[PDB]
Amino acid sequence: PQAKYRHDYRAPDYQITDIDLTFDLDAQKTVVTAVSQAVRHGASDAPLRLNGEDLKLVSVHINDEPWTAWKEEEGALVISNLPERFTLKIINEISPAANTALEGLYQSGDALCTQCEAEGFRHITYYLDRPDVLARFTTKIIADKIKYPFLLSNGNRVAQGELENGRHWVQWQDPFPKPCYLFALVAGDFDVLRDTFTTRSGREVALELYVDRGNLDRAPWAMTSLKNSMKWDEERFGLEYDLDIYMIVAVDFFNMGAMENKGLNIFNSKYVLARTDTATDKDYLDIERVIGHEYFHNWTGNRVTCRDWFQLSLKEGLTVFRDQEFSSDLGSRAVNRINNVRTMRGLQFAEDASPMAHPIRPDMVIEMNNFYTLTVYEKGAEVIRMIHTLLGEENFQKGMQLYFERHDGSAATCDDFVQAMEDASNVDLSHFRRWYSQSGTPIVTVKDDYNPETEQYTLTISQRTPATPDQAEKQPLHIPFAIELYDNEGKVIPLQKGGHPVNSVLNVTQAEQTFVFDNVYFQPVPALLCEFSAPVKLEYKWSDQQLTFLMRHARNDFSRWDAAQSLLATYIKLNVARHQQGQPLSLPVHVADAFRAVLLDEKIDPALAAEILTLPSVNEMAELFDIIDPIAIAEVREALTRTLATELADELLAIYNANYQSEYRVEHEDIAKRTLRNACLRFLAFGETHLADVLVSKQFHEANNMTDALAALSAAVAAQLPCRDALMQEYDDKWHQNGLVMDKWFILQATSPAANVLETVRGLLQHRSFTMSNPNRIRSLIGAFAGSNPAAFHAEDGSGYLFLVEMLTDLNSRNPQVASRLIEPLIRLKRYDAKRQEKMRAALEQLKGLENLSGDLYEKITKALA
Numbered sequence: 066p067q068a069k070y071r072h073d074y075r076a077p078d079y080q081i082t083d084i085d086l087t088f089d090l091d092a093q094k095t096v097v098t099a100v101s102q103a104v105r106h107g108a109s110d111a112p113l114r115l116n117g118e119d120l121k122l123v124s125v126h127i128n129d130e131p132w133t134a135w136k137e138e139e140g141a142l143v144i145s146n147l148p149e150r151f152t153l154k155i156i157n158e159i160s161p162a163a164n165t166a167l168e169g170l171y172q173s174g175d176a177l178c179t180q181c182e183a184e185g186f187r188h189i190t191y192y193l194d195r196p197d198v199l200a201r202f203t204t205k206i207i208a209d210k211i212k213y214p215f216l217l218s219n220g221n222r223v224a225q226g227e228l229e230n231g232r233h234w235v236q237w238q239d240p241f242p243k244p245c246y247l248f249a250l251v252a253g254d255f256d257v258l259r260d261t262f263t264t265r266s267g268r269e270v271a272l273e274l275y276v277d278r279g280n281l282d283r284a285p286w287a288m289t290s291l292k293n294s295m296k297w298d299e300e301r302f303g304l305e306y307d308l309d310i311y312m313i314v315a316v317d318f319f320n321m322g323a324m325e326n327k328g329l330n331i332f333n334s335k336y337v338l339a340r341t342d343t344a345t346d347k348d349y350l351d352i353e354r355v356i357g358h359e360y361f362h363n364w365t366g367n368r369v370t371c372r373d374w375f376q377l378s379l380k381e382g383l384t385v386f387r388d389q390e391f392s393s394d395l396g397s398r399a400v401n402r403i404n405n406v407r408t409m410r411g412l413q414f415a416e417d418a419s420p421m422a423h424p425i426r427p428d429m430v431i432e433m434n435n436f437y438t439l440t441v442y443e444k445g446a447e448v449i450r451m452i453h454t455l456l457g458e459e460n461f462q463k464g465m466q467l468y469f470e471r472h473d474g475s476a477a478t479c480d481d482f483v484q485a486m487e488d489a490s491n492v493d494l495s496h497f498r499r500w501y502s503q504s505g506t507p508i509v510t511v512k513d514d515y516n517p518e519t520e521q522y523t524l525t526i527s528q529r530t531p532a533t534p535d536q537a538e539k540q541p542l543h544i545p546f547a548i549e550l551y552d553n554e555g556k557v558i559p560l561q562k563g564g565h566p567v568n569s570v571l572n573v574t575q576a577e578q579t580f581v582f583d584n585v586y587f588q589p590v591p592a593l594l595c596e597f598s599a600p601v602k603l604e605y606k607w608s609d610q611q612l613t614f615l616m617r618h619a620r621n622d623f624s625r626w627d628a629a630q631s632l633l634a635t636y637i638k639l640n641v642a643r644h645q646q647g648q649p650l651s652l653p654v655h656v657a658d659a660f661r662a663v664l665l666d667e668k669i670d671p672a673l674a675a676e677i678l679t680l681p682s683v684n685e686m687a688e689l690f691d692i693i694d695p696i697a698i699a700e701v702r703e704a705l706t707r708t709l710a711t712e713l714a715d716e717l718l719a720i721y722n723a724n725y726q727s728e729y730r731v732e733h734e735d736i737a738k739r740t741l742r743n744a745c746l747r748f749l750a751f752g753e754t755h756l757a758d759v760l761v762s763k764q765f766h767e768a769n770n771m772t773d774a775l776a777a778l779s780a781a782v783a784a785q786l787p788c789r790d791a792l793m794q795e796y797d798d799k800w801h802q803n804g805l806v807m808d809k810w811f812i813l814q815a816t817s818p819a820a821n822v823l824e825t826v827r828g829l830l831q832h833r834s835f836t837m838s839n840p841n842r843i844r845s846l847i848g849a850f851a852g853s854n855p856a857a858f859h860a861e862d863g864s865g866y867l868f869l870v871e872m873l874t875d876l877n878s879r880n881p882q883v884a885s886r887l888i889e890p891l892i893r894l895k896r897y898d899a900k901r902q903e904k905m906r907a908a909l910e911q912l913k914g915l916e917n918l919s920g921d922l923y924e925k926i927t928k929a930l931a
């Protein structure tokens with residue numbers, strides 16, 4: 066497998082302007098006819114090089130002449146001696162039933178559906194499968210009417226007919242030129258939820274949600290979320306939908322979350338189907354975010370697309386930013402920000418410290434499917450958010466407007482977007498561009514001084530980014546560094562120097578810098594990196610009392626949560642060191658008191674209280690350490706939970722009871738109270754065994770919604786309560802027929818603290834609700850074990866690694882994309898002790914020797930073993 070490089074980008078020798086597709090559909094053998102109008106832009110003697118994978122060529126015609134001047138090579142059809150303008154006709158055969166990789170045209174249950182991003186269209190026909198080739202598509206679909214009564218593609222229906230022998234056909238046309246990654250086709254039998262949305266300017270849009278027969282009871286929330294998305298994009302961004310129909314198809318077999326195909330989105334059912342007895346608050350909010358995300362791509366990805374795949378963040382960073390802003394506007398901004406920061410610190414920072422580290426705009430890619438990453442998406446969004454921080458909303462919107470005015474109907478680059486922002490706002494983003502080209506997490510170190518003689522406060526701020534495996538050279542970045550200074554009464558001290566106000570967003574642009582503030586009338590308590598204003602690690606020598614002060618007084622709810630995290634971090638580190646020495650948990654009384662105060666504060670938003678009372682995950686905890694001790698981390702998290710449960714027992718029960726709700730509502734105030742109640746339950750489960758068992762079993766049995774039922778079940782597993790096996794069996798007996806619901810149960814099994822967890826997980830490979838054919842099942846059992854049970858995955862006997870090797874040996878052949886997702890915990894070996902490293906290295910070397918090793922795995926393994 067050969068690496069491709071961003072610096073090698075060159076404009077295509079040929080363009081295709083229009084393509085007419087015909088599919089004679091059948092699960093065993095589908096015949097594709099593709100008629101393309103092509104134009105040569107390159108040298109007269111340049112051949113047309115078409116991408117194709119696993120295609121059976123039938124014929125090649127140029128202007129209806131059977132062509133003799135062509136050759137097939139690895140991954141390509143190379144056509145020589147062409148006119149400047151011509152009609153290309155390709156007929157080829159493909160086999161959807163044989164497609165276990167779920168890229169190109171494949172089978173999902175009884176349905177046929179496509180996934181073309183990034184380079185799946187070349188698994189359908191020989192084409193210029195690159196996103197800078199935009200063409201107007203028409204799509205004719207011919208199929209058995211009984212099996213495939215619905216035949217869907219992008220755009221509007223322009224023709225339909227019936228044929229002999231029980232067949233029928235439907236032809237679609239999409240007026241907007243598109244790259245082939247946005248092509249979609251669906252054929253099957255569905256229930257359909259139909260609704261309408263009228264845009265601001267009066268365009269009526271038909272909304273159509275296609276689900277498997279019997280699933281119509283789980284469709285309305287997704288439809289509601291679509292309408293919410295449409296309305297918000299109008300209100301916030303001034304963007305309206307641009308076609309007449311908006312279709313969404315929910316499919317059970319899907320490697321990713323959802324896909325923004327123009328006017329015909331295809332979604333993993335995990336991000337569509339919800340009812341109050343099947344889906345949690347989290348699920349409802351995830352459906353909202355993902356429905357929003359795909360909708361927002363209509364402008365940021367579809368109307369303006371990517372010149373090449375190295376520009377992926379151009380659409381992903383921006384669209385993630387948009388989905389976060391949507392969720393934050395509609396719901397709790399503080400909770401959204403907190404959760405997104407958790408993801409950045411606990412998951413993205415780990416990736417940036419790994420062999421797979423890359424800039425948000427990669428320079429080198431072997432397998433593009435490996436680059437749909439936390440970095441490209443979540444760090445990409447943080448980079449967009451920094452632009453927003455530097456420009457302000459009004460300037461940012463002017464930049465968006467200029468971006469669309471310049472680039473609508475074209476494929477653009479990350480640099481084009483930055484240039485639009487810079488030109489519209491008059492803010493210099495030259496230095497800022499380094500965020501696109503430099504990998505790794507910057508470390509920002511802050512020292513302060515208060516001078517009582519002059520009433521000046523001085524911040525000395527330094528930055529460095531450690532070398533990463535991909536880049537030996539690192540330089541200073543333009544870091545927006547937001548601050549707020551508090552006096553002894555918790556009041557904000559105006560920022561000023563020399564008789565002039567100073568902006569609270571400091572421009573940290575050098576390796577080391579000094580910022581001086583005047584008229585600082587009291588020694589301040591600083592809030593630093595407010596709202597996580599740049600994606601960096603902060604090094605400041607906090608006292609416990611500065612942090613508890615901020616928990617009490619900080620203006621932004623995010624700062625109060627963040628202060629609690631800093632306070633906890635010190636004691637997590639202390640106690641992991643102690644665990645390694647065989648010593649029990651130690652925690653100062655005043656730390657427990659800070660959390661007691663949060664519980665008893667009658668003014669605090671329950672949404673904030675709930676997040677403060679949710680301990681950092683084992684992944685968040687891991688990023689506090691150079692060398693990760695996963696067993697120590699897991700046991701310290703439990704010990705901390707138990708200690709707080711004991712110290713706060715009375716207060717926890719009081720707040721648990723106070724937040725009882727008889728009515729279940731998917732409404733933000735209700736969600737907040739429920740999140741707080743269940744946060745309290747988590748601690749209560751780790752209290753006195755009898756009370757814990759009674760409370761947990763009662764909640765499970767009395768719950769009128771899945772959020773409360775699952776919270777109880779999770780607590781029973783986490784605390785290994787007496788009722789656990791009974792409750793787990795009850796859930797299985799009730800829900801075994803429902804894969805999405807069973808995913809939650811597989812996750813609980815996989816992340817169980819029980820000594821015999823691996824034995825149980827292995828046995829569950831034979832469970833009635835599990836199958837290796839379904840990416841969701843695989844992720845919920847195997848992925849959850851390796852990624853979310855690091856204590857068990859990293860068992861000292863090496864059993865976790867051996868198990869993953871077994872699974873990856875299967876998945877390498879079956880579904881390389883899912884295999885590559887699942888190998889990630891193994892490429893982190895350099896974060897672990899020498900003994901573990903050697904075992905992990907041995908596992909990787911076994912995989913390296915696999916017959917028919919996928920490019921997907923090859924890329925990760927070679928980086929890991931380097």
Ligand SMILES: N[C@@H](Cc1ccccc1)C(=O)O
Nearest residue numbers: 182183321322323324325359
């Ligand atoms: N393009 C999708 C993600 C995706 C990529 C590849 C395959 C499937 C889905 C999105 O970000 O909205």
Ligand code: NA
Nearest residue numbers: 393394396398
């Ligand atoms: Na809000």
Ligand code: NA
Nearest residue numbers: 512513514515
């Ligand atoms: Na100081």
Ligand SMILES: [Zn+2]
Nearest residue numbers: 358362381384
């Ligand atoms: Zn996206």
